[PDB]
Amino acid sequence: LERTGIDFDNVTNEWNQKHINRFRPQTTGSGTYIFEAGGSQFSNEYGHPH
Amino acid sequence: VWRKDATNFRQRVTIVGSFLKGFYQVDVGALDYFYDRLNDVVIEKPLEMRLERTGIDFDNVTNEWNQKHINRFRPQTTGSGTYIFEAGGSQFSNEYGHPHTSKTYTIGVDRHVSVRLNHPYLFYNVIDNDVNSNAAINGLTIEFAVGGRR
Amino acid sequence: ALYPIKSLGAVGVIADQAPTDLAPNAFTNAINARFVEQRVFKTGGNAPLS
Amino acid sequence: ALYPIKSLGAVGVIADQAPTDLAPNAFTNAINARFVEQRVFKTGGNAPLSYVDEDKDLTPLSFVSMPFDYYSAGNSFLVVGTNKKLYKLTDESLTDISRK
Amino acid sequence: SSVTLDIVSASLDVGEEIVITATASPEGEYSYQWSVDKTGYVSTTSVTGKSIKLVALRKGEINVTCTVSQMTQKDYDAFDDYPWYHAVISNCAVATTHYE
Amino acid sequence: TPQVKEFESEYFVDLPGWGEQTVVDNDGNPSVKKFNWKCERVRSFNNRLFALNMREANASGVTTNYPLRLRWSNFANENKAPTLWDDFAYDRVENGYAGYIDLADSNGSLIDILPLKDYLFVYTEFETYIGSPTNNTYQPLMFKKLFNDSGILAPECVVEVEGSHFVVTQNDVILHNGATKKSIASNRVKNMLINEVCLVNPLATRVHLHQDKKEVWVLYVGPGEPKESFACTKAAVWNYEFDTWSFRTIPYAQCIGLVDPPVLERGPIWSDFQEITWDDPSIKEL
Amino acid sequence: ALNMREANASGVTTNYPLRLRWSNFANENKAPTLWDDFAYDRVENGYAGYIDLADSNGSLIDILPLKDYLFVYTEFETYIGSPTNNTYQPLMFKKLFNDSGILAPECVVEVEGSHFVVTQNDVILHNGATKKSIA
Numbered sequence: 001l002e003r004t005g006i007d008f009d010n011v012t013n014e015w016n017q018k019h020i021n022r023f024r025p026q027t028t029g030s031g032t033y034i035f036e037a038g039g040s041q042f043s044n045e046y047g048h049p050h
Numbered sequence: 051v052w053r054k055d056a057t058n059f060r061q062r063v064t065i066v067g068s069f070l071k072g073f074y075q076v077d078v079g080a081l082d083y084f085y086d087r088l089n090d091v092v093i094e095k096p097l098e099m100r101l102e103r104t105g106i107d108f109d110n111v112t113n114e115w116n117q118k119h120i121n122r123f124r125p126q127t128t129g130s131g132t133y134i135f136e137a138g139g140s141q142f143s144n145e146y147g148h149p150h151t152s153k154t155y156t157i158g159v160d161r162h163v164s165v166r167l168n169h170p171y172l173f174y175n176v177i178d179n180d181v182n183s184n185a186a187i188n189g190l191t192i193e194f195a196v197g198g199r200r
Numbered sequence: 201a202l203y204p205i206k207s208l209g210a211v212g213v214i215a216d217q218a219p220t221d222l223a224p225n226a227f228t229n230a231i232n233a234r235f236v237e238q239r240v241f242k243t244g245g246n247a248p249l250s
Numbered sequence: 251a252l253y254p255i256k257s258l259g260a261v262g263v264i265a266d267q268a269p270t271d272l273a274p275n276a277f278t279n280a281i282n283a284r285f286v287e288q289r290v291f292k293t294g295g296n297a298p299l300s301y302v303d304e305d306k307d308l309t310p311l312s313f314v315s316m317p318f319d320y321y322s323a324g325n326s327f328l329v330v331g332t333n334k335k336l337y338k339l340t341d342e343s344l345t346d347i348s349r350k
Numbered sequence: 351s352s353v354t355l356d357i358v359s360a361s362l363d364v365g366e367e368i369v370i371t372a373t374a375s376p377e378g379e380y381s382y383q384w385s386v387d388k389t390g391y392v393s394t395t396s397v398t399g400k401s402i403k404l405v406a407l408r409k410g411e412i413n414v415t416c417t418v419s420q421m422t423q424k425d426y427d428a429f430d431d432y433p434w435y436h437a438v439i440s441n442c443a444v445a446t447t448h449y450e
Numbered sequence: 451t452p453q454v455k456e457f458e459s460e461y462f463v464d465l466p467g468w469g470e471q472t473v474v475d476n477d478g479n480p481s482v483k484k485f486n487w488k489c490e491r492v493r494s495f496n497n498r499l500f501a502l503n504m505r506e507a508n509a510s511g512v513t514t515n516y517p518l519r520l521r522w523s524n525f526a527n528e529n530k531a532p533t534l535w536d537d538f539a540y541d542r543v544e545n546g547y548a549g550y551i552d553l554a555d556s557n558g559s560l561i562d563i564l565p566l567k568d569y570l571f572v573y574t575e576f577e578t579y580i581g582s583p584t585n586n587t588y589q590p591l592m593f594k595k596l597f598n599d600s601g602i603l604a605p606e607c608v609v610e611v612e613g614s615h616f617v618v619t620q621n622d623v624i625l626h627n628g629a630t631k632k633s634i635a636s637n638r639v640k641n642m643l644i645n646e647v648c649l650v651n652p653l654a655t656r657v658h659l660h661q662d663k664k665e666v667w668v669l670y671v672g673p674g675e676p677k678e679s680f681a682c683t684k685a686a687v688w689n690y691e692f693d694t695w696s697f698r699t700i701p702y703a704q705c706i707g708l709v710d711p712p713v714l715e716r717g718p719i720w721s722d723f724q725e726i727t728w729d730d731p732s733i734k735e736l
Numbered sequence: 737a738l739n740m741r742e743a744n745a746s747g748v749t750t751n752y753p754l755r756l757r758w759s760n761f762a763n764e765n766k767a768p769t770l771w772d773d774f775a776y777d778r779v780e781n782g783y784a785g786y787i788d789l790a791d792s793n794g795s796l797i798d799i800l801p802l803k804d805y806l807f808v809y810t811e812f813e814t815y816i817g818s819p820t821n822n823t824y825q826p827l828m829f830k831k832l833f834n835d836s837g838i839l840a841p842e843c844v845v846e847v848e849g850s851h852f853v854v855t856q857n858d859v860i861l862h863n864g865a866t867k868k869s870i871a
Contacts, residue, residue, distance in 0.1 A: 001277050001279075001280050001283065001290070002277055002278050002279040002280065003269065003272075003276060003277045003278050004269040004270075004278050005268070005269035005270030005271075005272075005278075006270075006274070007126065007270045008253075009204070009206075009270070009271075011251065011253050013191070014124070014126055014191070014270070015124050015161060015162070015191075028289070029291070031292075041161075042157070042158060042161065043126045043127060043128065043270050044127055044128050044129055044130065044157050044158065044185070045158065053649070055641075055645070056644050056645055056648040057621065057641075057644060058620050058621055058644060058648065059603050059618070059620055059621075059644060059647050059648050059652035059655070060603075060620060060648070060652060061648045062620075063249075065249055066246075072248055072249075072250065073248065073249040073250065074246050074247065074248055074249060075246060075247045075248070075249050076244075076246055077243070077244035077245075078244050078245055078246060078247040079244065079245055079247065080242065080244075080245045081245040081246060081247050082245050082246055083246055083247075083248070096245075097232055097242060097243070097245035097246075098231075098232065099231065099232045099233055099242045099243070100229070100230070100231050100232075101227050101229075101230050101233065101240070102227055102228050102229040102230065103219065103222075103226060103227045103228050104219040104220075104228050105218070105219035105220030105221075105222075105228075106220075106224070107220045108203075109220070109221075111201065111203050114220070126268070126270050126271070128239070128268050128269075128270075129241070131242075143220050171220065178242045183242070184241070184242070185241065185242075186239050186240060186241035186268070187208055187239065187240045187241070188206070188208060188209075188238055188239050188240075188268035188270060188271045189204070189205050189206040189207065189208050189225075189271065190205045190208070191203075191204065191205060192203070192205065206271065207271070236266075236267075236637045237267075237637055238267055238268050238271050238637075239267070239268050239271075259692075259694065260692065260694075261692075261693075261694055262689075262694035262695050262696045263638070263639060263694075263695045263696055263697070264638050264695075265638060265639055265641070265642050266637055266638060266639065266640060266641045266642060267637060267638065280696050280697060281696075281697045281698060281699065282697075282698045282699060283696045283697075283698070284663075284687075284696065285689065285692070285694050285696065286689075286691075286692070287691075287692045293696075293698050296700065296701045297735055299711070299712070300712075301712050309704070310704065310705060311704055311705060312704075312705040312707075313705060313707055313709075314707060315707060315708060315709035315710065317792075317793040317794065317795070318457075318753065318793075318794060318795070319457065319460075320457060320458040320459075320529075320751075321460050326709070326710050328709055329455065336453075336462055341712050341713050347455070347460060347461050347462055348462060349453050349461065349462035349463055349464065350461065364475055364476075367510075393508060393509045393510040394510070395510045395512045396512070403510055404510075405509040405510045407473065407475075407509060408473070408474060408475050408476055409475050409476010409477060409479075410476055438555075438556045439554045440518060440552070440554050440558075441517070441518070441557075441558045458750070494790055495831075496831070497787070497788070497789065497790045525788075526754075526788055526789075526790040527788060528742075528750070528752040528754075528755055528788050529750065529751065529752050529753070529754070545824075565831060565834075567830070567831065567832055567833075567865070568830035568831050568832075585825050585828060586824070586825070609834075610833075610834040610835070611835075612867065613833075613865065613866060613867075659834075659835060661835045661855075661856075661857055662857055663857075664869075691869070
């Protein structure tokens with residue numbers, strides 16, 4: 001799964017920097033996922049992983 | 051080009067029967083063929099886009115007649131390119147305001163465009179004359195204050 | 201208060217109308233532009249063919 | 251204020267659109283995924299299948315599950331075709347019923 | 351110039367074939383277009399060739415003819431204000447200009 | 451030839467009456483003759499059988515291709531297939547009429563055909579049609595034009611889901627219930643599917659109604675593959691219950707279909723593994 | 737009648753899983769009295785016959801009426817029955833669906849101008865020409 005450009009425009013301003021700390025999912029069943037995350041200082045580029 | 055963008059499964063192209071003694075494609079990379087009667091020769095130049103909106107009174111936010119100091123436009127573009135922003139205004143509402151400045155918003159480096167105006171009726175224009183640009187504009191976010199009136 | 205300007209391509213050129221009574225996502229004049237419901241970008245140019 | 255992200259499966263992939271102007275329950279790309287209106291989970295993979303040991307060396311081009319046949323009992327079978335011949339299998343043996 | 355044929359009559363039976371050849375007096379190059387008075391009763395192939403093959407199909411008399419024509423160049427007058435429109439039917443195209 | 455397989459038979463055989471055409475000689479003496487007829491696709495509808503792009507031959511057998519010809523046979527019988535394809539019947543001097551219409555459209559090739567709630571829907575990459583079958587009269591089927599731009603991509607890129615059709619109109623997906631069409635991929639995956647399918651082999655695109663889970667995917671060849679390959683690799687699955695798009699991979703499918711599984715997976719029994727043991731003799735995925 | 741095992745002279749039976757016969761009209765406190773399709777051949781009303789449907793997987797298992805319109809189910813390719821007053825074709829059956837089809841011979845029942853069917857994958861509730869999914 002892949003989604004880019006999460007600007008939080010519906011909460012705060014886009015250009016504002018946002019410190020990301022945690023994702024609190026609500027899963028179901030058994031498994032073992034492999035989460036990946038990243039970003040970019042711009043809006044056009046597919047951010048690099050972190 | 052190796053792989054040109056396609057608009058059909060069979061990769062069909064729209065062609066034109068031109069007055070310039072030949073065929074021409076209508077929707078292709080940035081290039082415009084403008085004819086000149088002086089020397090009777092065909093001339094190719096970059097495709098010039100122009101957006102224009104006048105009379106931005108901010109009536110949905112503040113009063114129209116109130117003067118508004120314009121500082122920045124914070125767009126959210128997509129892709130690569132190099133735009134040429136223009137902006138201006140006028141102390142009235144009927145006149146197409148005169149320009150005040152112009153800046154280039156190259157994507158990947160700049161995050162905004164800095165313009166200084168205080169006319170109450172703002173107007174902004176967008177131009178893209180580059181040949182190697184395939185950018186896009188989803189939306190803007192203007193930073194402005196409020197002065198006075200009369 | 202909030203002053204967002206989104207969906208720049210939801211509606212395109214609106215002339216013959218008081219420009220000081222339109223929406224922020226409209227334009228009084230345009231050329232060589234292409235909109236799809238959320239976006240604006242330069243229209244594909246021209247080129248010969250033989 | 252509140253910032254919930256629910257119904258991750260209400261809408262799936264939305265490409266060709268400004269990713270910075272979509273909803274939080276959307277994705278710019280996906281593969282091998284399955285959504286039902288509130289949820290997302292890995293799509294069922296693939297695996298081989300052989301009614302008999304003779305079909306594992308065949309490149310079929312098309313087939314149909316015939317449910318009945320006068321000679322056959324109340325059991326379904328397959329009518330599979332290949333580049334040159336038409337075969338039939340019913341979980342017990344392979345037969346070439348190509349028109350002679 | 352005058353055209354003549356060495357064949358003027360023939361007796362056939364349904365199912366039998368025959369081939370006729372057209373030859374003009376001069377040895378020049380011309381176009382051919384075969385015609386038939388009563389539709390049916392025969393089958394033609396490559397009507398634009400100097401040698402046609404016929405196949406009796408039904409009972410009845412008939413009188414076949416071959417129209418030789420010396421095609422030549424001809425220029426149209428489809429100006430810019432009266433261009434072509436180029437409809438389409440049964441994979442066939444049309445010109446449909448003014449004055450023609 | 452289509453090479454039908456009868457219900458009470460164990461071998462394949464050519465269709466009966468395929469090529470039959472009634473001829474009337476002098477004085478009105480009827481007779482029948484068989485000609486070399488070759489087709490490209492055959493389907494069933496209204497207890498009849500159809501044909502597309504018939505290579506109808508004749509005496510003096512230089513074949514003349516009629517890419518817009520479309521023949522239909524008589525009604526079915528008890529556990530048998532139709533037995534008459536000749537349009538020139540009832541000429542030997544009431545019911546069971548066969549014929550054709552010889553449509554007139556653009557780009558022809560009359561590739562595909564599919565029924566929908568008693569109404570046919572012909573597709574030829576442009577200028578779709580509709581089939582209105584009557585009870586019995588001179589004109590049993592009257593075809594009326596429906597669209598000017600709509601048209602299926604490949605011969606098997608259409609399937610019924612819910613009183614509608616899932617078609618690929620050379621530019622996107624459409625879902626029309628009849629007299630009105632929509633776009634399921636207007637500005638979401640259009641530029642992605644067109645790009646991914648327009649590279650290697652678009653004509654290999656296929657579809658399948660995954661009714662088991664309310665999904666209709668459109669199979670197509672992967673991005674990187676030989677230009678001579680027809681094994682679909684990727685698939686764009688769409689759920690018609692919640693209108694969501696997703697993709698996946700398939701194991702090089704030349705075809706697809708639904709069928710019951712082997713006895714070992716159709717529900718086995720303890721007293722069936724009399725020859726099988728725990729040493730997984732070529733069977734582990736149980 | 738459904739899935740008739742119609743025999744004949746030289747009585748090696750030939751199964752016709754798609755055959756469907758219909759009898760004449762009822763009488764006063766009695767059942768129909770004619771099933772033969774080849775009547776009126778001895779040289780006006782009361783016609784019996786069949787259509788010999790053409791569908792997939794056959795077996796013509798179930799049948800049920802709905803507001804003067806029959807609804808045949810055979811696990812696939814459902815149908816509809818349109819009865820006319822009286823003519824050569826008293827009933828003209830038109831295809832309705834391509835995936836719908838009842839599961840067992842008695843998995844359908846009318847509730848409110850509709851049918852409660854099990855289409856091999858879920859429950860459906862169609863009023864006619866349109867179906868839904870209750871599960």
